[PDB]
Amino acid sequence: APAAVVTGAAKRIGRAIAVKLHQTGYRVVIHYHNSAEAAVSLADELNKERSNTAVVCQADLTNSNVLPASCEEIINSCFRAFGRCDVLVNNASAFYPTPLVKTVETQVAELIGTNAIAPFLLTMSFAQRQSNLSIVNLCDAMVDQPCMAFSLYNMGKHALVGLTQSAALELAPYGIRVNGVAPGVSLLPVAMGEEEKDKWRRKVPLGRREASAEQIADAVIFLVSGSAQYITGSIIKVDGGLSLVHA
Amino acid sequence: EAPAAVVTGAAKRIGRAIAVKLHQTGYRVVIHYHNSAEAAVSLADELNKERSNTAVVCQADLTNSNVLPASCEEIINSCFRAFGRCDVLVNNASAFYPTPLVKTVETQVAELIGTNAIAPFLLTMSFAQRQSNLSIVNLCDAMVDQPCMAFSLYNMGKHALVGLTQSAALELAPYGIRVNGVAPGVSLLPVAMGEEEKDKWRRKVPLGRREASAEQIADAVIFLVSGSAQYITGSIIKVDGGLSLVHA
Amino acid sequence: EAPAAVVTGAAKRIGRAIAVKLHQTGYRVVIHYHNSAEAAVSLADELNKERSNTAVVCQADLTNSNVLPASCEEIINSCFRAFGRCDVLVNNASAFYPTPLVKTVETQVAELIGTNAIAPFLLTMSFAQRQSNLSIVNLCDAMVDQPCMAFSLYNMGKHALVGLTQSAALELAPYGIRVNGVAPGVSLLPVAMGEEEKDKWRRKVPLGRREASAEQIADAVIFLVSGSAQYITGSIIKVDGGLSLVHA
Amino acid sequence: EAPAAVVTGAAKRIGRAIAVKLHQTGYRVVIHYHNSAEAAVSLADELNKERSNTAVVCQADLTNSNVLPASCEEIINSCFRAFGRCDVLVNNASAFYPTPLVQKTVETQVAELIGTNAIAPFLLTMSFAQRQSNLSIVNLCDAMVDQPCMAFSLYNMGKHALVGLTQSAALELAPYGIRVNGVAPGVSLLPVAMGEEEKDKWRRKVPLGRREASAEQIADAVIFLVSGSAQYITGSIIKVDGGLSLVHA
Ligand SMILES: NC(=O)c1ccc[n+]([C@@H]2O[C@H](COP(=O)([O-])OP(=O)(O)OC[C@H]3O[C@@H](n4cnc5c(N)ncnc54)[C@H](OP(=O)(O)O)[C@@H]3O)[C@@H](O)[C@H]2O)c1
Ligand SMILES: NC(=O)c1ccc[n+]([C@@H]2O[C@H](COP(=O)([O-])OP(=O)(O)OC[C@H]3O[C@@H](n4cnc5c(N)ncnc54)[C@H](OP(=O)(O)O)[C@@H]3O)[C@@H](O)[C@H]2O)c1
Ligand SMILES: NC(=O)c1ccc[n+]([C@@H]2O[C@H](COP(=O)([O-])OP(=O)(O)OC[C@H]3O[C@@H](n4cnc5c(N)ncnc54)[C@H](OP(=O)(O)O)[C@@H]3O)[C@@H](O)[C@H]2O)c1
Ligand SMILES: NC(=O)c1ccc[n+]([C@@H]2O[C@H](COP(=O)([O-])OP(=O)(O)OC[C@H]3O[C@@H](n4cnc5c(N)ncnc54)[C@H](OP(=O)(O)O)[C@@H]3O)[C@@H](O)[C@H]2O)c1
Numbered sequence: 002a003p004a005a006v007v008t009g010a011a012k013r014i015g016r017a018i019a020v021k022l023h024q025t026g027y028r029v030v031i032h033y034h035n036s037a038e039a040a041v042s043l044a045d046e047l048n049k050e051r052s053n054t055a056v057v058c059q060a061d062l063t064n065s066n067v068l069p070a071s072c073e074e075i076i077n078s079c080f081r082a083f084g085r086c087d088v089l090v091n092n093a094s095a096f097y098p099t100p101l102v103k104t105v106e107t108q109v110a111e112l113i114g115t116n117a118i119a120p121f122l123l124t125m126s127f128a129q130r131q132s133n134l135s136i137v138n139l140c141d142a143m144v145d146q147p148c149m150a151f152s153l154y155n156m157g158k159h160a161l162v163g164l165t166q167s168a169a170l171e172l173a174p175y176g177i178r179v180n181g182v183a184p185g186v187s188l189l190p191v192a193m194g195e196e197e198k199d200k201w202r203r204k205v206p207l208g209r210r211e212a213s214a215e216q217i218a219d220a221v222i223f224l225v226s227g228s229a230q231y232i233t234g235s236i237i238k239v240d241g242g243l244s245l246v247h248a
Numbered sequence: 249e250a251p252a253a254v255v256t257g258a259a260k261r262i263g264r265a266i267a268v269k270l271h272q273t274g275y276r277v278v279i280h281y282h283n284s285a286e287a288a289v290s291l292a293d294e295l296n297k298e299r300s301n302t303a304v305v306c307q308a309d310l311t312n313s314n315v316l317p318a319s320c321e322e323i324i325n326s327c328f329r330a331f332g333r334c335d336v337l338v339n340n341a342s343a344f345y346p347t348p349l350v351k352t353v354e355t356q357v358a359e360l361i362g363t364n365a366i367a368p369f370l371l372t373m374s375f376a377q378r379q380s381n382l383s384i385v386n387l388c389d390a391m392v393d394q395p396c397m398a399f400s401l402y403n404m405g406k407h408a409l410v411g412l413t414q415s416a417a418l419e420l421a422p423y424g425i426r427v428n429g430v431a432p433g434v435s436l437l438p439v440a441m442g443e444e445e446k447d448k449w450r451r452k453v454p455l456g457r458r459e460a461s462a463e464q465i466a467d468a469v470i471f472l473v474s475g476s477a478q479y480i481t482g483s484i485i486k487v488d489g490g491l492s493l494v495h496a
Numbered sequence: 497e498a499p500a501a502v503v504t505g506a507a508k509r510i511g512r513a514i515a516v517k518l519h520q521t522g523y524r525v526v527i528h529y530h531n532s533a534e535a536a537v538s539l540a541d542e543l544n545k546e547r548s549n550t551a552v553v554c555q556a557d558l559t560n561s562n563v564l565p566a567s568c569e570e571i572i573n574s575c576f577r578a579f580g581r582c583d584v585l586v587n588n589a590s591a592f593y594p595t596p597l598v599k600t601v602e603t604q605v606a607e608l609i610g611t612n613a614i615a616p617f618l619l620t621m622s623f624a625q626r627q628s629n630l631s632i633v634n635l636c637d638a639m640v641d642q643p644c645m646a647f648s649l650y651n652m653g654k655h656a657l658v659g660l661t662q663s664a665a666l667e668l669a670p671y672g673i674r675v676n677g678v679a680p681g682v683s684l685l686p687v688a689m690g691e692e693e694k695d696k697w698r699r700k701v702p703l704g705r706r707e708a709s710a711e712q713i714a715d716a717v718i719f720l721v722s723g724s725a726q727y728i729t730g731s732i733i734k735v736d737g738g739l740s741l742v743h744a
Numbered sequence: 745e746a747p748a749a750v751v752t753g754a755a756k757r758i759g760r761a762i763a764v765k766l767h768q769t770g771y772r773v774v775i776h777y778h779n780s781a782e783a784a785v786s787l788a789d790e791l792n793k794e795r796s797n798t799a800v801v802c803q804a805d806l807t808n809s810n811v812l813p814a815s816c817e818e819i820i821n822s823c824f825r826a827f828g829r830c831d832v833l834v835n836n837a838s839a840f841y842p843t844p845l846v847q848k849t850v851e852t853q854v855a856e857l858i859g860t861n862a863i864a865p866f867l868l869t870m871s872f873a874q875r876q877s878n879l880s881i882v883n884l885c886d887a888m889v890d891q892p893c894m895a896f897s898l899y900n901m902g903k904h905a906l907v908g909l910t911q912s913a914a915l916e917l918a919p920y921g922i923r924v925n926g927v928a929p930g931v932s933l934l935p936v937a938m939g940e941e942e943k944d945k946w947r948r949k950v951p952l953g954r955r956e957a958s959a960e961q962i963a964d965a966v967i968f969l970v971s972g973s974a975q976y977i978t979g980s981i982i983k984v985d986g987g988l989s990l991v992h993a
């Protein structure tokens with residue numbers, strides 16, 4: 002059985018991706034930062050289905066002097082548990098506004114670390130340890146029509162597009178594919194107000210609703226599958242047409 | 249009962265692989281063709297041997313002309329006539345040849361722009377006008393921003409097809425019709441292409457230094473028409489082995 | 497001696513402003529028009545009052561048809577007959593109206609795809625064939641990836657024009673002919689559009705909550721044809737006040 | 745009074761060309777530099793001999809660190825100290841070197857490549873805006889970001905982030921009348937460290953003249969963007985690449 006690492010997998014979209022990978026037959030490493038209880042509850046659920054097929058792994062993915070070592074250890078955790086690491090899903094992400102007009106350098110470390118630098122370091126560590134091997138990066142369908150006052154977040158997501166492309170090119174000779182999935186509106190942020198959630202939903206052409214986490218996870222499953230073996234450097238929007246709607 | 253799909257230019261090559269994979273997934277298929285009558289009938293016979301009354305052929309020229317709207321309406325009609333429904337449209341048929349800036353040019357326009365862009369638009373119109381998982385898949389080109397030299401009309405047509413994909417995704421979303429694309433890089437090389445040229449293209453592809461099989465292209469089409477793509481509309485999936493990421 | 501430019505659809509609105517600014521920069525101009533003869537002639541008279549023998553008009557329908565290649569060749573020829581040279585081509589003329597998926601459709605195709613894409617292609621062919629700072633500027637649309645609802649053929653035509661811009665840039669670079677685009681967002685609105693509707697569009701624009709003047713669009717054209725742009729080819733400059741960056 | 749501009753990494757090469765062209769257009773200029781003190785001072789001396797008290801130098805490292813926000817604030821402050829205003833910011837400074845995925849610390853490479861190409865532009869943009877006619881920012885991008893050089897992931901990441909900043913900042917700063925645009929070279933001045941045969945390999949790829957862009961050609965697009973001829977243009981990135989990005993593998 003192949004094995005996958007999913008970052009930020011205790012809740013929401015990460016959780017659904019881990020669940021669907023496990024349902025497909027993968028053993029999974031459930032990475033978490035603060036959500037230890039949820040991470041272990043997910044592992045307990047998956048291990049009840051198939052013993053010793055899910056483990057948890059804690060790490061902060063904020064940029065720092067220790068982030069390279071932390072990312073090496075996440076990949077190492079998959080090898081320790083399962084003896085291989087076939088799939089990496091870069092899902093973990095900080096998301097909050099950073100107006101141009103926490104210290105700003107902490108915001109940099111968190112927003113650019115989680116969205117871009119940790120994915121890069123995890124990609125390095127994944128590759129260095131190297132079958133259907135692939136990486137899937139969780140992008141953002143709205144990167145070119147960004148939310149107001151979210152410059153660092155947007156920078157991080159653009160950087161992640163860059164990594165997707167650069168790593169697809171560089172890792173192709175190792176048979177490692179690198180792709181992305183770009184939600185528009187999926188599970189709305191827990192802190193967003195109801196009326197705000199509804200305003201976003203009403204903008205989506207395809208059903209005037211957000212994507213379920215499972216719909217996002219379906220695109221991840223496709224990209225890691227045998228049915229995507231010639232696909233690398235591609236980013237699949239799963240956005241219900243939202244990015245096509247003008248102001 | 250079983251859903252039904254129209255695949256244009258389905259007698260050979262990628263369209264044939266798409267038709268076969270849709271049929272294997274459970275669809276009844278309209279095999280559109282232009283000149284390749286014997287291949288189209290042979291494919292229909294193959295599919296009907298597997299499940300009777302699940303494949304028919306439909307002949308049409310998709311060159312632009314004043315009768316092209318009627319021709320595209322008749323392809324969609326032919327699906328309803330055979331199967332009583334039309335769930336999926338795959339716009340695959342395509343003319344591809346150079347048109348240097350420096351057949352008459354009017355014919356070149358009609359063929360390249362008609363097959364790659366206008367016929368998809370008219371088929372899209374007719375599909376939409378006539379009707380649980382409805383979708384359209386347009387065969388695009390991953391290299392449209394790094395185009396082949398002296399292929400301006402072809403490239404224009406494929407860019408127009410991106411525009412149609414996006415515009416139709418937006419407009420047809422309220423009807424539950426998703427509209428997406430699949431963009432090959434190099435897949436089955438042109439029959440006309442010489443061996444050395446084919447080898448030069450193959451050697452450019454990062455992932456495996458080989459072209460895509462027809463089946464690999466069809467796999468992306470199958471995903472986009474499936475239940476696993478129900479929130480996906482207006483997306484174009486490159487299936488190019490990284491080719492478009494390679495600088496000059 | 498003075499360079500010469502062809503501007504399509506130059507009688508009114510953005511094309512007129514472009515022709516004026518090119519003339520102010522020192523170009524002789526061919527004012528192409530279709531229906532707006534009186535305005536074309538008035539512009540020519542104004543320009544020739546400023547400097548005699550510097551402006552001529554040229555009538556043609558740019559709808560797609562069997563005669564469009566000849567018509568386009570004639571427009572280019574008119575610049576050579578008048579001025580002895582043709583240094584700049586500005587593809588500005590454009591039909592724009594909705595074509596819902598759900599006039600006959602073949603005429604809509606001819607008009608929308610002809611004016612926005614096929615006539616630019618044929619004009620580009622004829623320009624190149626007759627061939628220093630030579631360049632072509634195509635009037636694109638900054639909103640082509642977030643298009644107006646029910647404008648599929650228009651959007652297809654503008655996408656095709658992006659592809660032409662790219663393809664022609666690549667192919668014509670060895671002749672030193674640069675090919676670029678200018679992409680307005682909201683510029684001149686219909687005069688007859690109610691101000692309340694105009695204001696809905698204006699309020700969308702981040703930079704000043706107003707539409708671009710024709711002259712602001714023309715400024716970008718002037719840059720691209722200038723000596724300050726001699727390494728720029730295949731580039732499309734948005735002149736949109738940030739509109740294309742604004743989400744739904 | 746004459747307007748004032750800050751050009752990062754302006755001692756040499758493209759940045760100097762931009763500073764020179766802005767100065768010739770009537771701007772007073774802050775010549776930011778990191779290690780090239782001699783070159784920076786030489787340029788300032790030359791510009792002040794054309795017009796007295798119209799150029800100053802400003803030294804800063806633009807590597808990311810917890811003091812980078814203060815350093816960026818101080819570059820903008822230096823423009824106001826010398827000239828009383830700051831109308832234009834050109835984010836030109838850039839680290840550029842490979843970072844292979846498979847095998848000087850990686851954290852240093854992150855701090856340099858992401859800091860110079862993205863974070864310092866962001867912080868300078870914040871400081872520029874907080875301190876405020878024809879105000880604008882021009883970011884030096886890269887026309888090849890979607891067809892990147894092999895083994896340059898962190899550089900490419902940085903330049904993609906800079907695209908994101910250009911767009912985000914154009915949106916957010918539009919109500920302040922600050923336009924934010926980019927200029928994206930393909931091949932311009934080749935690296936000093938490259939041999940002529942390798943330079944020629946790159947030159948031969950360029951459809952328009954089989955040559956790199958001069959520094960002045962890049963600067964010409966910057967000057968257009970800061971000019972009155974670009975007053976409705978924001979969020980736009982102009983490729984100045986001779987068609988290079990249109991050429992397939
Ligand atoms: N939801 C949407 O509509 C949407 C739209 C566009 C893009 N996306 C992208 O899709 C992905 C999943 O979205 P989501 O909404 O499910 O994400 P989310 O709930 O915002 O974040 C996912 C997880 O990231 C982890 N994380 C955050 N900061 C971290 C840090 N410093 N170190 C390590 N891990 C950290 C958290 O793990 P712990 O809980 O364990 O601390 C969190 O549960 C993200 O990449 C997001 O950007 C989502
Ligand atoms: N192969 C590749 O590497 C590649 C690369 C990029 C994109 N694509 C796209 O993928 C699709 C499939 O590629 P392919 O190589 O399999 O295509 P293809 O063999 O060039 O053409 C497919 C079929 O199009 C039909 N067709 C051509 N002109 C027509 C006309 N005037 N009216 C009606 N039908 C017409 C032909 O049908 P008859 O034989 O019955 O006459 C032909 O067999 C095309 O859209 C192509 O542009 C392919
Ligand atoms: N206005 C905007 O906000 C906006 C936004 C985005 C892009 N653009 C682009 O900018 C350019 C100029 O826009 P505009 O608003 O000034 O254009 P416009 O007023 O819609 O049209 C310009 C001219 O095109 C000519 N034209 C139309 N159909 C033709 C045909 N069949 N044959 C020949 N010529 C034909 C007409 O010439 P006659 O009057 O002589 O018949 C007309 O005056 C266009 O390419 C447009 O798509 C404009
Ligand atoms: N040259 C090309 O072909 C090309 C192609 C694509 C994009 N571009 C972009 O165009 C811009 C100019 O290119 P270029 O070739 O002229 O650049 P460059 O010579 O590589 O670098 C410009 C300057 O950046 C400064 N810099 C580097 N690291 C720094 C740091 N840690 N802190 C502060 N400043 C630092 C250096 O200043 P000091 O010398 O004072 O240390 C250097 O002179 C860059 O943004 C580049 O990415 C250029």
Ligand SMILES: Nc1nc(N)nc(NC2CC2)n1
Pocket residue numbers: 093094095096141188189190191
């Ligand atoms: N990390 C990230 N990124 C986006 N775009 N949206 C969200 N959504 C909610 C914070 C949970 N999360």
Ligand SMILES: Nc1nc(N)nc(NC2CC2)n1
Pocket residue numbers: 341342343344389436437438439
């Ligand atoms: N229609 C089309 N389009 C492309 N890109 N390639 C091909 N390949 C060869 C004519 C079969 N055909």
Ligand SMILES: Nc1nc(N)nc(NC2CC2)n1
Pocket residue numbers: 589590591592637684685686
């Ligand atoms: N995008 C576009 N294209 C043309 N040809 N004309 C127009 N006219 C504007 C609605 C007045 N807009």
Ligand SMILES: Nc1nc(N)nc(NC2CC2)n1
Pocket residue numbers: 837838839840886933934935936
């Ligand atoms: N900063 C930067 N960025 C690019 N692309 N090219 C260059 N040339 C560098 C001096 C070698 N520098």
Ligand code: NA
Pocket residue numbers: 059060061071
């Ligand atoms: Na830790």
Ligand code: NA
Pocket residue numbers: 531532533534
């Ligand atoms: Na008239």
